[PDB]
Amino acid sequence: MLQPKRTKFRKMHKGRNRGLAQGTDVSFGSFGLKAVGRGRLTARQIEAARRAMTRAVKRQGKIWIRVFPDKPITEKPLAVRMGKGKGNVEYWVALIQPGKVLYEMDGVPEELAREAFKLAAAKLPIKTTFVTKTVM
């Protein structure tokens, strides 16, 4: 599971997730999954979708993961009242906006990568599409 090796601070505010995305292109491989919805992607969903698409192409070709879960999420333990500080860090997410390319491939036929990206997209909570490389 992807996770920062070392961090400056242990916890982060909640924040918001407004706006569109930077990184809306296929700049490494030939095909990719572009996100159409907005939300969070955890480290267990990124890892589960990478296993599904690696196992679909029989490890022929290259795969680029193009997002990283760098934001910590905390939860209070069970049956405690409010307050008394902040919770404990439980997992890490990546914030997703309409337009991000999440994965890449190169070195497979265009027809086989659509099937591989279809099995991958069934593991994520965000609606995605299939995109190709452009000249400009």
Q: Contact residues for Mg ion (CB under 5 A)?
A: 16, 18-19, 94-95
Checking phi first, is residue 79 left (phi over 0); if not, alpha (psi -120 to 50) or beta?
left
Residue 94 binding: pick among Mg ion, other proteins, none (C-beta 5-8 Å cut-off by kind)? Mg ion
Distances (CA, A) of 107 to 74, 116, 124, 127: 40, 13, 24, 25
Amino acid present at 60: Q
The residues pairing with 41 across neighbouring beta strands, listed in sequence order, are 94
Tell me if 65 sits within 8 A of 124, measured CB to CB.
Answer: no
Residue 21 binding: pick among other proteins, Mg ion, none (C-beta 5-8 Å cut-off by kind)? other proteins
* Minimum separation from the CB atom of position 111 to Mg ion (A): 31
* Minimum separation from the CB atom of position 24 to other proteins (A): 6
CA angle 112, 116, 117 (to 5 degrees): 115
Residue 122 binding: pick among other proteins, Mg ion, none (C-beta 5-8 Å cut-off by kind)? none
Of the pair 19, 87, the CB lying nearest Mg ion is at 19
Of the pair 32, 69, the CB lying nearest other proteins is at 32
Amino acid present at 8: K
Residue 39 binding: pick among Mg ion, other proteins, none (C-beta 5-8 Å cut-off by kind)? none
